[PDB]
Amino acid sequence: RATRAFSQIKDAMVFAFNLPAIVEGFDFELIDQAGLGHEKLTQA
Amino acid sequence: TLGAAWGGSYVNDFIDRGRVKKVYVMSEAKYRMLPDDIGDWYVRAADGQM
């Protein structure tokens, strides 16, 4: 419900959640190996 | 002057293609290869004179 309401707020990313049963899906990285520089990795 | 010319001196760091590396100042080889080359180096005194 909370999220549902907060979605109404323009000009912001607001959402609410529970922290998972582990107090301490994926996470994919993208490495600049050959030293191409920030705007090129942006593009990548 | 002695040290930087003859030993080389680590000034500060620069970025080379996204990666930090050293900046070294030091004499060209020919100007530090021999004992008589020692005299060839000038230092500026307080009256602006070499």
Give the Cα separation of A41 and B18 in Å (integer): 12
Q: Which helix (H) or strand (E) holds B9?
A: strand B9-15
Tokens standing for residue B10 = 């680590």
* A3 at interface of B, judged by CB pairs closer than 8 A: no
Experimental method: X-ray
Give this entry's resolution in angstroms: 3.3
* Cβ-based contacts of A35 with chain B (< 8 Å): 17-19
B20-25 and B9-15 as β-strands: parallel, antiparallel, unpaired?
antiparallel
Instruction: Tell me the β-bridge partners of B23.
Output: B12
Beta-carbon count within 10 A of B6 CB:
15
Q: Which of A8, A35, A11, A20 is nearest to B21 (CA)?
A: A35
* B17 at interface of A, judged by CB pairs closer than 8 A: yes
